[PDB]
């Protein structure tokens, strides 16, 4: 079950391994389009959070689920901000979301007075007046129940067939690693010139024991120059100083 676009599942993904299974290479999706990230680098990157916005749309409106777009869904049902980090993933659902007489459990906002804000749900049943007559609770002549059903039926056109779309909204990791790709651990090498990754702060240097006393919440640390001075080892919590290689 996916929501019609009126509401959507917004389950938050955290404290886990975001193995993205190179889904973009699975060919199970018609659309797999990333904006603030390269789709091939998703397994290297860490996020504080990933949110998966999950809903059903018509094929001709797949193109509207993108930042900065306009259209009936983009403006009244599901809006993405111009500034967006995440990936839009979509695929055909004829054998789940379509019924012979039409699946009418999927509805979208058709009649709205103003645009929807980025990422807010509408979930409204307010009767909309398209004319000058108050039509107060009349729901006819010139006013409408705002939510319209879709003719999701098995032999309709490809642009009318339902598609499942999931938008993965990303919060870049400003936090201790929370959501990351399928990284492998290594041993710890002190001294010598080492190319290191941790939870980010990728760089090269010589890792040595630190005499710094970090407060229990700090994790990381910097110099006057805004450079990394020291890093708390994500495992066992030893503080290591980072010295540039000669």
């Amino acid at each position, epitope marked *: 079950r996916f929501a019609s676009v009126y509401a959507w599942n917004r389950k938050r993904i955290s404290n886990c391994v975001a193995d993205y299974s190179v889904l973009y290479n699975s060919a199970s999706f018609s659309t797999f389009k990333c904006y603030g990230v390269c789709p091939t680098k998703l397994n290297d990157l860490c996020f504080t959070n990933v949110y998966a916005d999950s809903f059903v749309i018509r094929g001709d409106e797949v193109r509207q689920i993108a930042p900065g777009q306009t259209g009936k869904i983009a403006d009244y049902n599901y809006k993405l901000p111009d500034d967006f980090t995440g990936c839009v993933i979509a695929w055909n659902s004829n054998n789940l979301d379509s019924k012979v007489g039409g699946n009418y459990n999927y509805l979208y906002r058709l009649f709205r007075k103003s645009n929807l804000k980025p990422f807010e749900r509408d979930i409204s049943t307010e009767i909309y007046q398209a004319g000058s*007559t108050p039509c107060n609770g009349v729901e006819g002549f010139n006013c*409408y129940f705002p939510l319209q059903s879709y003719g999701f039926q098995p032999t309709n056109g490809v642009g009318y067939q339902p598609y499942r779309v999931v938008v993965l909204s990303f919060e870049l990791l400003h936090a201790p690693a929370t959501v990351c790709g399928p990284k492998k651990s290594t041993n710890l090498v002190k001294n010598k010139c080492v190319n290191f990754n941790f939870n980010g702060l990728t760089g090269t240097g010589v890792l040595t024991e630190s005499n710094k006393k970090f407060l229990p919440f700090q994790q990381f640390g910097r110099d006057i120059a805004d450079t990394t001075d020291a890093v708390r080892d994500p495992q066992t919590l030893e503080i290591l100083d980072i010295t540039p290689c000669s």
Partner: antibody
Amino acid sequence: VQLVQSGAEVKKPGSSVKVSCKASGGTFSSYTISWVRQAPGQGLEWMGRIIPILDRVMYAQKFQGRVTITADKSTSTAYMELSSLRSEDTAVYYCARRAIDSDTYVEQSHFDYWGQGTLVTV
Amino acid sequence: EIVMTQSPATLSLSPGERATLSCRASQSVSSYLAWYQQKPGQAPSLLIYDASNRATGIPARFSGSGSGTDFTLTISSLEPEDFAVYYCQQPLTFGGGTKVEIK
């Protein structure tokens, strides 16, 4: 343009009356079709309307139960069924086009292209 | 629902005389009215829209005015061919109509 109506008929009370208004061109989506009752020698009463573009129908309260309205997407045709036929309910009835419309729901006011109507009695 | 009363029930005029036709609504219809002309046995033809504007194909002698609940049609000179029953159409209903007859 035109609404092509069904002819006249006489039926036993309780037997449903079903007629239709066929039209060429992109009228299913371009116009709303309304059904109006005109007992002979009388003025007009609204029965109901179908907005085929939105798959929705509105009815006059006095005609609820009594009137069922639908439409066919292939060769735009409006259909109406009058249930619970009574000899008292003898009338000429017709389809009319709500000329002001849009795919943006601009909203309707008046009508044109009236089909005049078909007499149905007992 | 919205209900309309028309007046006079019957208008008796000589050809060439000025006709005034009144329509009164139970509640406001804003400007959502249309006027139609009925020949006996016929469904009436469009004359006016949005409660005042002359419909395409209609002679300049026919025009209206009014708002909310109070509406009217002025026929500057009523010709023999114009002695029709005049009706006001409300959003979802019709008024009783005025039968215009030759005196």
